[PDB]
């Protein structure tokens, strides 16, 4: 019938869904279906970005080419589509010489039955694929060009791939077919690189998940100032778990830390000080690991202390150590409050921790340089950490600092962080921090 009916029908019949995850996923999908614009989709990992090109591909008359970096995830995408009985093929390196011969044979065929073709950037840019490609171009088969993991064009997206800089010329040969670019990487620098590198037609239809979540209360505490660090964390956990309601503990929480030793010790200290906490790290047997995870999920143990890692009622996330990046901190802290109820995100910052993490990052970079020489991209790793340091040391709204990093508008923070609740208090704490290293 109408556009909405076709979409709703395929959504249910093919993919098995009664609705879209979000109005944003819906709007993005409809903009791809309409086919009048180039489209940029920027949503977190797991938001269902794939549907935004997979579904309109099936509604189109031609084939959809999808460029994706790693064959592993490609195969998982293909396997998933195969379970949906979707006619999906993948051209990459893992294919044998005859397997390519058969896939090429279909694409060179009049009215091929390949609907969606996954391909790596190297294969899409290989001199061997150009004949098959030029045929598709000139015979006007192509409905969509999809560039997944579009951040790979960027020296600032933490996974730069040279072959992704070849996709722009490829797209320009196709003024006929709309281009859809998708990624979870949400910085303005990366977005600008994507638009230019893929030669996207302007104005681009942008569908981007807003970062600001008003039910999360962010604050930064300076370990240098805390007289009783374990007691401080204990009280933070108990408050968040609904201590003052006197109806028993409610919800759960996570404490992130860098080392297994801190993990084990924090779990001990918290348990001794009045909140049941269990350690979770790679040094444990996978047995004990699975047990602790379940005890947390099943709310037998309210607090998990973790070195690594989606429950809906996470009332707090505390970072005992500053994270390696702003993106990392945002994703980790953002595990709190998925049910929409009030939650607390606290970062325990210390300049000693800052120095140690900065040191470790630069040691990692140096290892990479010994391996494959200097790269333009190595500054990105440092800057991503520096943005989180600024977040900790700066006076201003915590939600705003996060928004700035992702290029979002000014958050309507209604006393939703420590700075906005009491700016003078935060300024006083920052002044005490400077005095701690004074004469
Ligand atoms: N409308 C929807 N309703 C429910 N689940 C969905 C919907 N769209 C996608 N999903 C599911 O969400 C999961 C994440 O999809 P994926 O495309 O891998 O996310 P992303 O690419 O954004 O990381 C997939 O398992 C997919 O089946
Ligand atoms: Mg994806
Ligand atoms: Zn604020």
Residue numbers in the entry: 10 to 318, 324 to 453
Task: Show the paper's wording.
The ADP bound structures were solved by molecular replacement using the APO form as a search model, with two RECQL5 monomers in the asymmetric unit of the monoclinic crystals, and four copies in the triclinic crystals. In the ADP complex, the ADP moiety is bound in the active site, making extensive interactions with residues in the D1 domain, several of which belong to the conserved helicase motifs Q, I and II. More specifically the adenine base is sandwiched between the side chains of Phe 26 and Lys 30, making π–π stacking interactions with the former and van der Waals interactions with the aliphatic region of the latter. Gln 34 (the Q of the ‘Q motif’, also known as helicase motif 0), accepts and donates hydrogen bonds to the N6 and N7 nitrogen's respectively, conferring nucleotide specificity to the binding site. On a local level, the residues forming the bulk of the nucleotide contacts from motif I undergo a significant helix to loop transition, exchanging several hydrogen bonds from canonical α helical hydrogen bonds, to phosphate oxygen contacts, with the entirety of residues 53–55 shifted significantly to accommodate the nucleotide.
Specific roles have been established for RECQL5 in almost every cellular process involving DNA, including transcription, replication, recombination, chromosomal segregation and DNA repair.
